[model samples]
Target: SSNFNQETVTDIHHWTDTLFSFRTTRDPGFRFQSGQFIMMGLEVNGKPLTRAYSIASSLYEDGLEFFSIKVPNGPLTSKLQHLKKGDQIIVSKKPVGTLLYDNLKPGKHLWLLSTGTGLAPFLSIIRDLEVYERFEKVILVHGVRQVAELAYTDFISNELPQDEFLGEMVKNQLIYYPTVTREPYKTRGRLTDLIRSGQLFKDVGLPEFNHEDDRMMLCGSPEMLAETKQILEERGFTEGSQSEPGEFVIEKAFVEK
Candidate 1:
């Protein structure tokens, strides 16, 4: 009951009616790894209710950044969407998640696969300096319904180069691969289709995915995760866990929120 803090919302950037990014003060004692998720919400009827949201900002940053999809009828987000810069938000003291770098085995290529808000954790991972220091090549594959919905990815594309440290880290070593399923744009079709057609390699000019040298992390809807996992398995990739590191790892961007 006393563990959480009511921090002020410092800023809000709305990308779409359904998506936004918000910044809030970090609790004095709050600490989380780059890719971890934390719980946040408001007190209702004297009861604290919160949902897990991936930490979008890199660990090195002072304040926390979180990207969120506003669910119209969601118990928390519906109310959260109405919050302003000075409004107070309840944040849990402890941050817990299994999507950190330690969960994946060492490899040359690091692949981050995501869709919708699932790109949250990977946003944190790619912005971290450790990601570049550990792997030779980093590939971020983001799939969304509309090109307009690719706002966050677009932000990353623009910001990474302007960041002195992350810019150098990404120099000639990082690739942003975006795919759109429901709209016609630069890259059309789902990631699974791109991967299956061998077009992913052709477009990116990279070698094929192999368990021996490629490590992957996935985030998205349950069906999308399952479908992607099936594709990865068909390509000989093994599932990874926090305890036993392997070639692949999976996590949900949002859980029943």
Candidate 2:
């Protein structure tokens, strides 16, 4: 309502049949941590039909970016998929989320585990100037059902490495690990299975998860988050949040439209 900001869409890119990313005008007053999200959407009928979307762009950027998956016949995406440049989107003025860097303890390896559009927040995190100072390695894992479903692959693999400011550290510290489930590729299988079987660590050439040295950020469907959380808990990882910092943090990326 009155607490939201009306912003104009600046650009849009359809990554696949079901995925896309968009850029929008940012309010000079709009502020959010790298991994936080705000409610954003179009006005439907007479009211706003908004949902929580992680800000995908870097914190210092003038334009805001967001990633979304199109759901057929769904309330938001069904209509959102038709959006174009110059369209206005309503966004909550204040952002809130549990995925920020402040929620985790200091560690050597910062593992960003995601699925599909869940990769949103990490896009901002990896680009943030502070992440490099806090951890030696930032392993980004994008789990999808097909290669085409891996949105922003070039942005993550190429553009980020070539970034003028963060390039130096990003080139050496950032690692992109994408896994497909239904398609034939080098890395295949559910991320949960890979983690449970210790294959993920071997493939990434990283040591197994250690509560003292590894901090994880999980964002994905509830099933994946719960499954991965259980695995981490079984191995002695504590769930973290705004109130208390812990070995790991989990956020549901949502399966709904």
Candidate 3:
């Protein structure tokens, strides 16, 4: 018997032709930290087809949420994108990842850097009140190829701060910066360029990146991760792991050939 549980989808929201998000019933035994990834999939031809997905909902929430991209000919997403409410999906019980709050040393500010569907884990991290309690400030920087690819803009910009318990903290401490490449938007450019030029700090009214007071979490393509990690390391930021806390941590957004 497999350890994965069959959870029914409760809600689904299509953000764009390429992106979508869904909510599902949470199992009583399924518990995970705020920022973690789990195996999720659906049955295809009598075989279980699964992929690791970041849990996008807060642990405090009654259910689980996931954000995904519809990859053309992807082994799982090709079929997963057609999922509807009440559809059955497999959710693995064991959740794991290095993006946890516990993976970084104490800092004054938390910087979440993500690209594409990499934004999923950060959504869960931001929704949890514990994140606000730990750092004096939280900065979320999401970069997408186009403006239309930006998902959960309303939730982070509006609904989140308006939330009862998180409102005050969000109002005072949360900072959201969304950027786009290959499309016209208020903020245009790659994240690395913004950081290197110090524009990201200037726009947010914060000082330049420093390892001492700032901690970071990064998720994106392997190229993006490499570039960002190099920049962080150049600025004295050390990569962290679950066993050894440091100034920064990173995870690949998805496994792609």
Number of the top-ranking candidate, with lDDT as the measure: 3
- Model 2, runs deviating above 4 Å: 255-257
> How do the residues 1-257 of candidate 1 rate in per-residue lDDT, one tens digit apiece?
57788788898998889988898887767777877888888877778877888888777776777788888898888988887988877888888887778888898998888889888898889888888888898999888999878866656687786788778777667899999988898899988888888898899787999876788889988778889989988877788777898888888876652
Off by over 4 Å in 3: none
Q: Which wins on TM-score, candidate 1 or candidate 3?
A: 3
Full-model lDDT for every candidate: 0.83, 0.90, 0.91
TM-score of each: 0.95, 0.96, 0.97
Clash count, candidate 2: 0
Model 1 misplaced stretches (Cα beyond 4 Å): 255-257
Q: Write model 2 residue lDDT over 109-211, tens digit each, in one string.
A: 9999999889999989998999999999999999999999988888888788888889999899998999999999889999999998899999889999987
Please list the Cα RMSD from the true structure of every candidate, rounded to 1 decimal place. Answer: 1.5, 1.3, 1.0
The pairs that clash in candidate 2 are: none
What 10-residue stretch in candidate 3 is worst by lDDT? Answer: 43-52
List model 3 lDDT by residue over 1-257, tens digit each.
Answer: 27788899999999998999999999988999987999899977767789989999888888999999898898888988999989999988889899988889999999999999999999999988899999999999999999989999988898888998778899899999999999999999999999988899999999988868999999988888999999989878889887899999999997657
